[PDB]
A paper describes a structure:
Proteins of the Ras superfamily of small GTPases regulate a variety of cellular processes such as intracellular transport, cell shape and motility, as well as differentiation and growth. For all of these processes, switching between the active GTP-bound and the inactive GDP-bound states is of fundamental importance. We describe here the synthesis of reactive acryl derivatives of guanine nucleotides that are able to react covalently with strategically placed cysteines in GTPases to lock them into their functional states in an irreversible manner. Extensive analysis of biochemical and structural features demonstrate the maintenance of the signalling ability of the modified GTPases.
Extending the labelling experiments to other GTPases, placing a cysteine at the position equivalent to E35 in Rab1b led to covalent interaction with aGTP for all those tested (Rab5A, Rab6A, Rab7A, Rab8A, Ypt7, HRas and Cdc42), albeit at variable rates, but substitution of cysteine at positions corresponding to L125 in Rab1b only led to covalent reaction in the case of Rab7A. In order to determine the structure of the GTP-bound state, we introduced two further mutations in addition to the cysteine at position 35: one of these was Q68L, a position equivalent to the GTP hydrolysis-deficient Rab1Q67L variant. However, Ypt7Q68L hydrolysed GTP faster than Rab1Q67L and we reasoned based on structure and amino acid sequence comparisons that the residue K38Ypt7 (I37 in Rab1) close to the γ-phosphate might play a significant role. We therefore introduced a further change at this position (K38I). Using this Ypt7 variant, we were able to produce a covalently linked aGTP adduct that was stable enough to allow crystallization within 12 h at 4 °C and allowed structure determination. Structural comparison of these adducts with Ypt7:GDP and Ypt7:GppNHp demonstrates that the covalent linker provides sufficient flexibility to allow the covalently locked proteins to adopt similar conformations of the nucleotide-binding pocket and in particular of the switch I region of Ypt7Q35C–aGDP, Ypt7Q35C–aGppNHp and Ypt7Q35C,K38I,Q68L–aGTP compared with the non-covalently nucleotide-bound proteins. Despite this flexibility, the electron density around the nucleotide and the linker was well defined in Ypt7Q35C–aGDP and Ypt7Q35C,K38I,Q68L–aGTP, whereas in Ypt7Q35C–aGppNHp this was only true for two (chains A and B) out of four copies within the asymmetric unit. In conclusion, the structures of Ypt7 modified with aGDP, aGTP or aGppNHp are very similar to the non-covalent Ypt7:nucleotide complexes, demonstrating that the structural properties of GTPases are maintained in covalently modified proteins.
Numbering used by the authors: 6 to 181
Write the structure that this text describes.
Amino acid sequence: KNILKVIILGDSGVGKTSLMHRYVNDKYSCQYIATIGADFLTKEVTVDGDKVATMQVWDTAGLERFQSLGVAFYRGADCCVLVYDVTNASSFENIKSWRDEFLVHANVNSPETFPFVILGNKIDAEESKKIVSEKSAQELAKSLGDIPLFLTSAKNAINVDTAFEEIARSALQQNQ
Ligand SMILES: *CCC(=O)NCCCNc1nc(=O)c2ncn([C@@H]3O[C@H](COP(=O)(O)OP(=O)(O)OP(=O)(O)O)[C@@H](O)[C@H]3O)c2[nH]1
Ligand SMILES: [Mg+2]
Ligand SMILES: [Y+3]
Ligand SMILES: [Y+3]
Ligand SMILES: [Y+3]
């Protein structure tokens, strides 16, 4: 009865709640409502056709100072999703910070093999606003352990399911 805990980290505003809503419920709103608290949605998933699982996807506030649950957010995760916004250089520069935050709080026994997935969200944005290049993102993903990178739009439903299937796969791997 495979239950997979996935947590999503990243700065305030990058699209964490939007990517979860898109994946689970296919909903998206242009309006911004900052996440208060921590909670999860549920998605039934199968990996490789034959491996049935329930994925619990957890979402809380982006900035650490408004992360109400604290350490308990991180505990027992099978995969950590790290999200930046391609229109915000600071968010991208914080991806290593978030990876490090997780490894300390989740006290993982094999940091070099624990599953992270990087999502560069907001790929639909006006081109002149897009200030983080895919090349930089690929360079960071290599340098953090050859972790998978997906470029996504929660808004226009680009690559969100594909990303989450790799999150699911890699969480199953870890959980087993
Ligand atoms: C719909 C109006 C419109 O066309 N706007 C133009 C560009 C919109 N691009 C765009 N692309 C996406 O893929 C987006 N995902 C989310 N958002 C928007 O950004 C704001 C923040 O979203 P949240 O999911 O609330 O971010 P989160 O990380 O969850 O913040 P905290 O809780 O941590 O604070 C929202 O306005 C959302 O619509 C995209 N926008
Ligand atoms: Mg949110
Ligand atoms: Y869907
Ligand atoms: Y911290
Ligand atoms: Y080693």
